[PDB]
Amino acid sequence: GIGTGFPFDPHYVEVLGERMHYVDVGPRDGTPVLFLHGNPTSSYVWRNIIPHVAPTHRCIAPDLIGMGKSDKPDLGYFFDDHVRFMDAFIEALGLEEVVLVIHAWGSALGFHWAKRNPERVKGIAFMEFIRPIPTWDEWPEFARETFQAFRTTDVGRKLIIDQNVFIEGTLPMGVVRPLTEVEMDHYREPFLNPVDREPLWRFPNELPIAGEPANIVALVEEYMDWLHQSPVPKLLFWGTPGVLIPPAEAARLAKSLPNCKAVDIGPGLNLLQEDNPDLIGSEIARWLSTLEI
Ligand SMILES: CN(C)c1ccc2c(-c3cc(C(=O)NCCOCCOCCCCCO)ccc3C(=O)O)c3ccc(=[N+](C)C)cc-3oc2c1
Ligand SMILES: [Cl-]
User: Fold this and answer.
1) What does UniProt list as catalytic?
2) Cα(252) to centroid(ligand 1), Å
C-alpha cells in the first residue's frame, strides 16, 4: 500500500523574518534535489518519492510560506510572495547548483527560478505543471464551473476559506485512487483555522487562464519560451486524463521541448505523486544517474 506516514525530522530556517520548514535527507555531498509542492499540498506530497532518491542524493523539500509546517505571515500569498520567500529560502540554505523536482504551483516557482538562474539548474523533473490556459475551454470540463467560482471574492472565498472546499473536495478530485483518512488529516493539518486558508484561495486566483491575471500569464509565457529552447535536461511525468496537462499535450511537449524524456504513470489527475509514487521516484533516481551532477 502507498505510505501514509511522514517520518522526516523537521528542519527550520529563518527566511525574511519567517520560519520555513523543510525536509532535508540524504548524503550531504553532491548536487541536491529540490522538491517544490503546490496547492493545497506540502512536502507531504513528496513523502513516497523522496525515499527513492535519498539513498544517492540530498533531498530538500520546503513547505511554501503559509503552508505545511512553515510560518503563516499576514500576507496576500500572491505568486510574487511565494517567489520572494522561495528565492530567499534557496539562498539561506546556501544552495549552488540544483536539480529541480516540481509540481503544479511548485512548477511555476521552479521554472521561474530556473529561467532567472539557468546556470544553477542541472535538470528539471516536472509533472502536471502550469502553462497558460488560453480559454476556459482548455480547462477540464468536470472542474470548469468550480474554478470559475473560485476566482471570485464572494463565492470563491465562501467555498475555499469558509468551507475548506479546496482541501475537502478539490484535493481528492485531483487524485484517481481514494485518499485515506490519515492522508486527508495530514493535508488538513495546516489549515484547521479558516484564517489560515488565504493561500488556498489566492493560488487559483493566480492561475493563468483566459489572459488573467495578465502579469502571471506573461511570467508563465516567459518561462515556457525559455523551456522550449533551453538545453536543460527535462523529465516529464504525465497521467490519464490529467488536469493541467492532458496526455496529448504531454506527448507534444516530449517532442517539442529539447532533451525531454516523458514517462506515463498510468491513471492520474493532478497529484500524480499520490497515484504512482514508486514509478515517479524510481524514474527520477534513474534519470539523475544520466546527468552531469
Ligand atoms: C462543504 N461544502 C460546501 C462542499 C462543497 C463541495 C464539495 C465537493 C465538490 C468539489 C468540487 C470541486 O472541487 N471541483 C474542482 C475539482 O478540480 C479538480 C482538479 O483540480 C485539482 C487541483 C489543481 C491545482 C492546480 O494548482 C465541485 C463540486 C463539489 C460538490 O460536491 O458540489 C466535494 C467533492 C468531493 C469530495 N470528496 C470527499 C471526494 C467532497 C466534497 O465536498 C464538498 C463540500
Ligand atoms: Cl490553484
Assistant:
1) 104, 128, 270
2) 30
